[PDB]
Design a protein around this ligand. Structure first.
Ligand SMILES: Nc1nc2c(ncn2[C@@H]2O[C@H](CO)[C@H]3O[P@](O)(=S)O[C@H]32)c(=O)[nH]1
Length: 96
């Protein structure tokens, strides 16, 4: 299940940077950005393979990719944020 919707303005600023890179088709800072997210745990709605893609949301100061990600779906404005490495997701509202 999706935890609710959150205003893009309420997420860390780096989430806005990721969304802007997704709108321009990169380039992305990590080679793992844009790979398929399989939704293996069934947390997001069931869809065909390839419907979802995952992108890193940079954690300031981290040496690794950390735990924040944006997951996009194929629908218009369907983007989810996770701050705990795919345990919970919120739908991102880009209008606020
Ligand atoms: N938990 C989880 N991670 C996934 C799934 N599909 C892809 N990933 C992730 O996205 C990338 C490719 O498999 C990997 O980098 P990462 O974010 S560390 O975790 C892996 C999935 O269904 N579940």
């Amino acid at each position: 299940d999706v935890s609710g919707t959150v205003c893009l303005s309420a997420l860390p600023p780096e989430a806005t940077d990721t969304l802007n890179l997704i709108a321009s088709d990169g380039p992305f800072p990590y080679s793992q950005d844009g790979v398929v997210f399989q939704n293996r745990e069934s947390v997001l709605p069931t869809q065909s393979y390839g419907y979802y893609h995952e992108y890193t949301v940079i954690t300031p100061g981290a040496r690794t990719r950390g735990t924040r990600r944006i997951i996009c779906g194929e629908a218009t404005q369907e983007d989810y944020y996770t701050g705990d490495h795919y345990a919970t997701f919120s739908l991102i509202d880009q209008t606020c």
